[PDB]
Amino acid sequence: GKRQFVNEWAAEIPGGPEAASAIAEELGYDLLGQIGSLENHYLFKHKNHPARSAASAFHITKRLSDDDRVIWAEQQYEK
Ligand code: NA
Ligand code: NA
Ligand code: NA
């Protein structure tokens, strides 16, 4: 069938793991850890957005991507 989005975001943060934790705190996420195919790819879990929704939360992605420490960000679909 079709998949819903989860309240988790992947992001590329070249500044590294300390920056990842600082970004999470500032923008309202828990850091989940490292993912992806590159070293400085991190997964975040938003502290307030619903765990599961059909909504594509483009506005949260834009806030994350708009931080200059974050060069790329992507809301994740559920598995
Ligand atoms: Na929901
Ligand atoms: Na950015
Ligand atoms: Na994106």
Residue numbers in the entry: 27 to 105
The authors write:
Proprotein convertases (PCs), including furin and PC1/3 among nine mammalian homologues, mediate the maturation of numerous secreted substrates by proteolytic cleavage. The zymogens of the furin-like PCs share a multidomain architecture comprising an N-terminal pro-domain, a subtilisin-like catalytic domain, and a P-domain (also called HomoB-domain). Activation of furin is triggered by two sequential autocatalytic cleavages and subsequent release of the prodomain. In this work, we investigate the structural and functional basis of PC-activation to engineer prodomain-based PC-inhibitors.
M2 includes three Arg-Ala mutations to prepare a stable prodomain:furin complex. To verify the conformation of the secondary cleavage site loop, we solved the structure of isolated M2 at pH 8.3 and refined it to 1.3 Å resolution. Indeed, this region showed the same conformation in isolated and furin-bound M2. For the structure of isolated M2 only the positions of Cα, Cβ, and Cɣ of the side chain of Arg78 were build. Gln30 was modeled in two conformations. In the isolated structure of M2 and in the complex structure with furin, we found an unusual interaction of the His72 side chain with the amide nitrogen atoms of Asn74 and His75. The donor-hydrogen-acceptor angle towards Asn74 (169°) indicates a stronger contribution than the less optimal angle towards His72 (155°) as determined from the isolated M2 structure. The distances between the amide nitrogen atoms and Nδ of His72 are in both cases 3.1°Å. His72 can only act as a hydrogen bond acceptor in a deprotonated state. Thus, protonation of His72 at pH 6.0 will change a productive interaction to an unfavored contact, probably destabilizing the conformation of the secondary cleavage site loop.
